[PDB]
C-alpha cells in the first residue's frame, strides 16, 4: 500500500540541496523512487542471500556491508 510513496517530496528536496543542486523540477520524485527501488532491490537481494546462507533468519550489518563490497561500493566502520 503506497509503500514506495513513503519517499516525500521535501525529503528529496532537502537531499538535492545537500546534494549540491538547487532547482529540482518536479518530474523526478517518481524517477527517484524508481532508481532507489532498483538499487535497493540489488543490494537487498545480495544481503538476504548472505544472511540465509548463514542459515539465519535476520539480517545483520555485516551482511549489508558485504553486499556493498560486492557492488564495489564498500563502506567503512563495521567489519571491512
Amino acid at each position: 500500500r503506497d509503500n514506495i510513496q513513503g519517499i516525500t517530496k521535501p525529503a528529496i528536496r532537502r537531499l538535492a540541496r545537500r546534494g549540491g543542486v538547487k532547482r529540482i523540477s518536479g518530474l523526478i520524485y517518481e524517477e527517484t523512487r524508481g532508481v532507489l527501488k532498483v538499487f535497493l532491490e540489488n543490494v537487498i537481494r545480495d544481503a538476504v542471500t548472505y544472511t540465509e546462507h548463514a542459515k539465519r533468519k535476520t539480517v545483520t550489518a555485516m551482511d549489508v556491508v558485504y553486499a556493498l563490497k560486492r557492488q564495489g561500493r564498500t563502506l567503512y566502520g563495521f567489519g571491512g
Binding site: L68, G72, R73, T74, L75, Y76, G77
Partner: protein, 91 residues
Amino acid sequence: AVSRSQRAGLQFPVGRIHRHLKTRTTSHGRVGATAAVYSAAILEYLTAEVLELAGNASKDLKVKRITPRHLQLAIRGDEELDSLIKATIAG
C-alpha cells in the same frame, strides 16, 4: 632477544602482521619475514601521511579531537589519498 619490529625500530607489530598474512597463504605461502617488515613500514608511512593530513584539517579547524568530516575533507583535498580510498566514507 628483541622484537623484530622493535629490532628494526618500527611501530607496527610484525608478528601479528605475519599471522594475518598466514591467514591467506593458499596452503603454500611462506612469509618472508622481511616481507612482513616491508608491509609494516608501508602501512606505517602511509598512515602517517593520512594522519598528518587529518591533523592539519583538525588544527586548521581549531579542534583537538578527530571527526569523520575531518578526514572527509582531508581526502577531498588530496588526489592520491582519494585514489587509495575508493570507498564511500561513513559520514
